[PDB]
Symmetry: C3
Subunit: 331 residues, 3 copies
Amino acid sequence: AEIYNKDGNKVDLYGKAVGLHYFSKGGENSYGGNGDMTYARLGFKGETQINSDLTGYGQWEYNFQGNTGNKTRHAFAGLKYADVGSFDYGRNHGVVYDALGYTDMLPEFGGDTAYSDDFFVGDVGGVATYRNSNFFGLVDGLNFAVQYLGKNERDTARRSNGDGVGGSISYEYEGFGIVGAYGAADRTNLQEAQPLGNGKKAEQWATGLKYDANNIYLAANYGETRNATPITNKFTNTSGFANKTQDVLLVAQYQFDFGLRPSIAYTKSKAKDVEGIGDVDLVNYFEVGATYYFNKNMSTYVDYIINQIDSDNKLGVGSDDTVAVGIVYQF
Amino acid sequence: AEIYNKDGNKVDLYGKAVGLHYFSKGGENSYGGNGDMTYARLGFKGETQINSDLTGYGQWEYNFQGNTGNKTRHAFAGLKYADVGSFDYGRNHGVVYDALGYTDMLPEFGGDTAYSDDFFVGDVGGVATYRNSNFFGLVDGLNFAVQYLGKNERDTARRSNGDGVGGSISYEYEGFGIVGAYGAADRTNLQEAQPLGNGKKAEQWATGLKYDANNIYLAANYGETRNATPITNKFTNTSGFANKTQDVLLVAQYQFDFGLRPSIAYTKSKAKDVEGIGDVDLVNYFEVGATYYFNKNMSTYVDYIINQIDSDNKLGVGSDDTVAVGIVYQF
Amino acid sequence: AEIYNKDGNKVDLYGKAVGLHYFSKGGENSYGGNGDMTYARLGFKGETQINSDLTGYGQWEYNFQGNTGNKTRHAFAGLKYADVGSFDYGRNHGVVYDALGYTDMLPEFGGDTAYSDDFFVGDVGGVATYRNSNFFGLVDGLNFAVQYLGKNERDTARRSNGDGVGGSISYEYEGFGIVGAYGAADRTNLQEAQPLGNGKKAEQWATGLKYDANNIYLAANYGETRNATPITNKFTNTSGFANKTQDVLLVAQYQFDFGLRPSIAYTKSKAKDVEGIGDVDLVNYFEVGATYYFNKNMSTYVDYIINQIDSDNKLGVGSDDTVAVGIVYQF
Ligand SMILES: [Zn+2]
Ligand SMILES: [Zn+2]
Ligand SMILES: [Zn+2]
């Protein structure tokens, strides 16, 4: 929904309402919880044409919970020059999300390893991102990004980070996409004080393949982290980071013409060398679900998580299944 | 204010600014308090036409305090089919508000028994509501709704609830409306732990008549609750629910052509079998007030509460008068 | 960006995204801090034409932090009559900001003495403001305002205030503006309980000159306060108000045609008769900075604060420099 178009400036307002309910046994010990999870979104996107070759842009988006959970998701501005690329700064996706966003396609769940405020894998504040598409207008399909992560010292370890760099490479050909991304940063003094996880530097990287054509969507991600994945020991009420993780995400979806979109997926996340515990799974589930698209504005969906986590998990990660049911209006 | 109209999708943005001040003696012991109460509202309403017979819709609205008090008020989406009715899920009005909203017409106050997060009587999160108007297109004026209330377990008893059902019937003829509504739900374990109120099931119901024609508005509500009205003993700092309440609300207003709209009202709420106290009034006042409408966008108002609560109230409910003065811009 | 124009009602939606980073040594002991400070703004402005001579209006604006700091900035409505003036009530600027806003022109910093929730000098809630421009349509350039400040009793002393009055006079001629403003109010019981600052009445006043023409901007402010400037003793973790302050702000800026806008400024704030301390500076710095305007929608900026505060400051006010870098998209 555009609200302004004059002097080469465009503004688009957008938002959605999501009525959303989670079902689990009784649901402290489930994958997703139990109860109401309804929320709304509001944001704008602006693009201004400064000259023939240069464009300016900003974007904001907020999450309002309708059930705590109220969050800015995007807040950034930047410039794009003809074939040199684009620069922007703000709260934006980490560059490793260039890989991980390949499998972030399920109706409600999925994307379990794209934590917010976790350096590079997800929704993070204070990142400057240089981006180049089709490699200086020379090689169509080939894209790359480099990103500087500013130091964020905050009250909790979970949401803090030090100075860091990362980058991504992508190639997109005949309906396929392959991607690799890597990032490293300093850990804050407070993080290194935490019980779990130890090391001066944190690191995250992932690769990915996707196929997005002929009403099919199929994507696979492999990632590894060092000292970067936040974990909590629900038994001893201890927090920190996992020294190493190894994560696999697979998704397969097909889009029927009449608007039904079934989905199957798998997610497995394993921490290694966790202080006190050793090897323990963080995430392990299959997902079967479907979305029904009535049109570009309206949809409903059901998202079942068959949880492979064992009830005897040592970190006390929840072992029960959760199904989400959701109805969505967006503009 | 519509911002989109193409492909049978409409989006309306709306909001208002309310400059608002309350006056009381000195005002801990007043009906309404004392000081600034200014606030703003923002929301959207969308409607998409899926086919000949089916429509999709969503709605969101937020309250921003300008003086804590920041709240989502509506967040829901749903579908409406030609003469079968409508279904929606989200944060919405309880179905008992179908009755109580008859007397919710005063400039600033009123509607004292339509608590938020109180099962069925007001603004509540996690409700699926089926609605039918003109009874399958057969009997004009006759409407009914049934509603399922999902279990909401939260940190305080006041804002939690268990699984529940409710319904409403309404008839609207020659300027009149009559309505009855009823709802029952399980109380959470935490609620039953509270000092005040005891019982496994909570219940609320109300009836109402209104006359809304010839520039007149006249409405009466009677309600009763069991184990559902939140009460606080300000003497002993004790909380819970009233075992029984009996509530009466009357309103009478006339709209002058030149934009003045005087208003008189009465509200009385009595709790019975309150643990330790017995019978005690929660609300007891007369209201005299007026709104001046300059047009569809601008208005000011004054709202005087003559408080009948006695200073010796045993729950320490406040006994002093409050007048509100308010100026409002809306679009 | 206007979204409505029919029946003499106009609504303008507006907002901006600001990617913003502060740089300081290591930055507890700096002027501005250190890290990400990105934020977004959203607001509307409405104007309705009631009759030939009378107009209604409302305005709201919110600040969303993207890094706590989420705030309503404006929320008010009012009426303007042909040559009698205008009245409005809400969260608005104190009338002393009529003076202080002259020097509030730097890219990111500046305006250090226009505290929010500080009676009269800045962003304050619960003020009714009468305003008259060109003195009843008789003397072009000559303007005045009188303002009543309602009592705000809150949990902290810093953000509370009692009943008060203030006013301002302004003259604007051939590119110049001169202004004087004054305000006085009661201090709340809680404020008078604080360690620092003592007196029953608080007072603030300031004068100002500005020159705003030929691509130049030049402004000077002098102010004094009594018992109104909030100060904190970071050594002993003590709070309150300064018994007296004396504040000077100077700014000089030039706007190049091609969009560069260099800026130099000076700010000095001195508290006197501070309980335990005596005479101590609160603010003391030079600013050199520049903004680059690409157009009416896009801009970037750098803002350097050369901090004159001494490391041996007795209130433990921070002594290090801070440079801000920022990119801005607005509509
Ligand atoms: Zn995002
Ligand atoms: Zn409502
Ligand atoms: Zn302001």
